[PDB]
């Protein structure tokens, strides 16, 4: 049906400007359903998922700029003007940056931008730790259905998803392979994205499970975005690993922080 469509309507009712959330490298935005309980219950929530999932024969975007233009089209279809509130995680963070710059060049107003623990890429020497990991994409998918974490493979995750959530019943080997395809493409887009300066404030959520890390280190990690952000760079830390940021407690903290900044 509509489980894998590019624009994913997680909640359409609400009079305020929607929050648009862009997928991690895995391509699925069902994970941001963990936010609905905690953002204002009058805020619509839309997901943006990767081309190539609903239609495995679709031409995948070859740059983050092209992916961002596609998604800007989609979100302008839902919200004609007003402040655009974007949220990203991993690849989505890069995508929303591009979206935000494009929206600005169009004279549109950009509201809240929430970056879940993604930092700029050294294009001459891409650090593995700055890039998506396949096991992390599978962990994100397993968190989506509350799998108790205590080497993953696609078939096991698909079986948990089809068991667990009824709307993944018709998730077949075609869709599993399309997920792998989208992940590979998304990984090939990190090394070639050059973000442009953005005249807006950004909120960066830092995933730091180690509480022995000094606050200055979190702030310095966050200031890697300074060459591309001309506004305030605000940050907040959750005590979990990068893939676990939509588990119940970090999702609650992120959602409540978002609600208070949109209020």
- CB 173, min distance to its own copies, A: 4
User: From the list 153, 199, 234, 249, which residue makes contact with its own copies (rule: CB under 8 A)?
Assistant: 153
Please state the closest distance from residue 261 (CB atom) to its own copies, in A. 33
> Using the rule CB under 8 A, is 220 a contact of its own copies?
no
* Per CB under 8 A, 107 contacts its own copies: no
Q: 199: number of CA atoms within 13 Å, CB side?
A: 7
- Cβ 150 to its own copies, closest distance in Å? 18
152 near its own copies (CB under 8 A): yes
Q: Is residue 192 a contact residue for its own copies (CB under 8 A)?
A: yes
> Contact region for its own copies (CB under 8 A) — 1-9, 32-40, 132-140, 142-150?
132-140
Among 172, 165, 175, 236, smallest CA distance to 206 is for: 236
- Least distance from its own copies to the Cβ atom of residue 61, Å: 9
The only residue of 3, 102, 131, 224 in contact with its own copies, by rule CB under 8 A: 131
Q: Does position 170 bind its own copies by CB under 8 A?
A: no
Question: Which residues in 69-98 contact its own copies (CB under 8 A)?
Answer: none
Pick the binder of its own copies from 170, 177, 220, 227 (CB under 8 A).
177
Given 123, 146, 234, 248, the residue binding its own copies (CB under 8 A)? 123
Binding to its own copies by residue 169, rule CB under 8 A?
A: no
Q: Which is nearer to its own copies, 119 or 154 (CB)?
A: 154
CA angle 51, 199, 43 (to 5 degrees): 55
187 near its own copies, rule: CB under 8 A: yes
For the chain, the three-class secondary structure string (H helix, E strand, C coil) is CCCCCCEEEEECCCCCCCEEEECCCCCCCHHHHHHCCCCCCCCCEEEECCCCCCCCCCCCCCCHHHHHHHHHHHHHHHCCCCCEEEEEECHHHHHHHHHHHHHHHCCCCEEEEEEECCCCCCCCCCCHHHCCCHHHHHHHHHHHCCCCCCCCCHHHHHHHHHHHCHHHCCCCHHHHHHHHHHHHHHHHHHCCCCCCCECCCEEEEEECCCCCCCHHHHHHHHHHHHHHECCCEEEEEECCCHHHCCCHHHHHHHHHHHHHHHC
According to CB under 8 A, which one of 9, 14, 56, 120 is a site residue for its own copies? 56
Half-sphere exposure for 110 (CA within 13 Å, toward CB): 25
Q: How far is the CB of 156 from its own copies (least distance, A)?
A: 7
Interface ranges with its own copies (CB under 8 A): 56-57, 60, 62-63, 123-128, 131, 134-135, 138, 151-156, 173-174, 176-177, 180-181, 183-185, 187-188, 190-192
């Amino acid at each position: 049906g509509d489980t894998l469509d590019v624009l994913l309507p997680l909640r359409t009712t609400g009079e305020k400007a929607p929050l648009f959330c862009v997928h991690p490298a895995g391509g699925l935005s069902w994970v941001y359903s963990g936010l609905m309980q905690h953002i204002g219950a009058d805020r619509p929530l839309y997901g943006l998922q990767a081309r190539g999932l609903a239609d495995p024969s679709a031409t995948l975007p070859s740059s983050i700029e092209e992916m961002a233009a596609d998604y800007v089209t989609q979100i302008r279809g839902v919200q004609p003007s007003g402040p655009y509130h974007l949220l990203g995680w991993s690849l989505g963070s890069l995508v929303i940056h591009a979206m935000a710059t494009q929206l600005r060049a169009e004279g549109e107003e950009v509201g809240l931008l929430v970056n879940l623990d993604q930092y700029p890429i050294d294009r001459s020497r891409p650090a593995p730790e700055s890039q998506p990991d396949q096991q992390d994409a599978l962990r994100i998918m397993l968190d989506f259905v509350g799998y108790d974490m205590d080497p993953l493979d696609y078939a096991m995750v698909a079986d948990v998803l089809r068991e667990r959530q009824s709307v993944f019943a018709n998730l077949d080997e075609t869709a599993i392979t399309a997920l792998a395809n989208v992940f590979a493409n998304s990984r090939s887009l990190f090394g070639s994205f050059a973000p442009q300066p953005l005249d807006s404030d950004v909120l960066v959520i830092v995933a730091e499970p180690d509480e022995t890390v000094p606050a200055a280190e979190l702030a310095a990690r966050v200031e890697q975005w300074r060459p591309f952000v001309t506004g305030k760079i605000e940050y907040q830390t959750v005590r979990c690993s990068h893939p676990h940021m939509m588990q119940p407690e970090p999702a609650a903290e992120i959602g409540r922080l978002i609600a208070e900044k949109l209020g």
